[PDB]
Amino acid sequence: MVKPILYGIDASPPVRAVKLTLAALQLPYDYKIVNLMNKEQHSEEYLKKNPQHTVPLLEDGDANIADSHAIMAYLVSKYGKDDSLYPKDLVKRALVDNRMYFESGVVFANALRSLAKMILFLGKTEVPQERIDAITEAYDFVEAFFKDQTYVAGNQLTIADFSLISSISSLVAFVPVDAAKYPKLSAWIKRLEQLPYYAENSTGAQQFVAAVKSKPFTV
């Protein structure tokens, strides 16, 4: 009976996407803190587990999986007692995959990580307008995802919603979501806030926001 181990810290958006998924699956697991501020991802012990020095990492028995999106797909496929969260139908799965690849690059790499690195790590107090533009571009794209639908990848909650909420709920540290401009995006956030296990995201999202607010900058 495998109980997996998750490595991470709650402030990290992709770690929170995996925390939401584990909670949705009601799957017990051990959680090991990798304090990124203590540069703990660069330890010799952790670099053996993950040469990319990133979190989250999941150890599942003898398996070692990095990347929140790979981890979430793996978790649902192995332990999911239905497949609503990651449907087996190929066209619907492709939409969930598409939305997670979108989160990986357009949201996380291009908008979030870039700006967070500048502010939280490099101590910059001025950032170019393009870093703010990356954020509003992401919001604009996600607003358009909804159409006549409730969630980012269909009419059911999927791991793509967990992926995208983890980062969008972090980006609001930099640019709050204008509810008038983004009504569908705002409603979707409100909907997810009502999940019984949403604190697996909101606690760390609030920590991320607090860390960002303590490092002011101009543009």
Point out which residues bind a second copy (CB under 8 A): 51-52, 63, 65-67, 69-71, 73-74, 77-78, 90-91, 93-95, 97-98, 100-102, 104-106, 108-110, 113-114, 141, 144
Collect all residues with Cβ–Cβ distance below 8 Å to 187 and sequence separation of at least 6: none
Total interface residues for ligand GSH by CB under 6 A: 17
Binding residue per annotation — 99? no
Report the DSSP beta bridge partners of residue 6.
31, 58
- Classify strands 57-60 and 30-33 as parallel, antiparallel or unpaired: unpaired
- Binding partner of residue 55 among a second copy, ligand GSH, none, CB cut-off 5 to 8 Å per kind: ligand GSH
Q: Name the one residue in this structure whose structure tokens are 């304090």.
A: 35
Q: At 48, is the secondary structure helix, strand, or coil? A: helix
Binding mask 49-88 for ligand GSH (x = CB under 6 A): ----xxxx----------xxx-------------------
Q: Are 108 and 14 in contact (CB under 8 A)?
A: yes
Q: Which stretch binds ligand GSH (CB under 6 A): 73-81, 97-105, 125-133, 177-185?
A: 97-105
Per CB under 6 A, 108 contacts ligand GSH: yes
Binding residue per annotation — 53? yes
- Binding partner of residue 138 among a second copy, ligand GSH, none, CB cut-off 5 to 8 Å per kind: none
Strand order through the sheet with 30-33: 30-33, 5-8, 57-60, 63-66
Q: Are 22 and 6 in contact (CB under 8 A)?
A: yes
CB of 64 to a second copy, least distance (A): 8
What's the number of CA atoms in the CB half-sphere (13 Å) around residue 17?
Answer: 35
Q: Which residues bind ligand GSH (CB under 6 A)?
A: 12-14, 36, 41, 53-56, 67-69, 101, 104-105, 108, 113
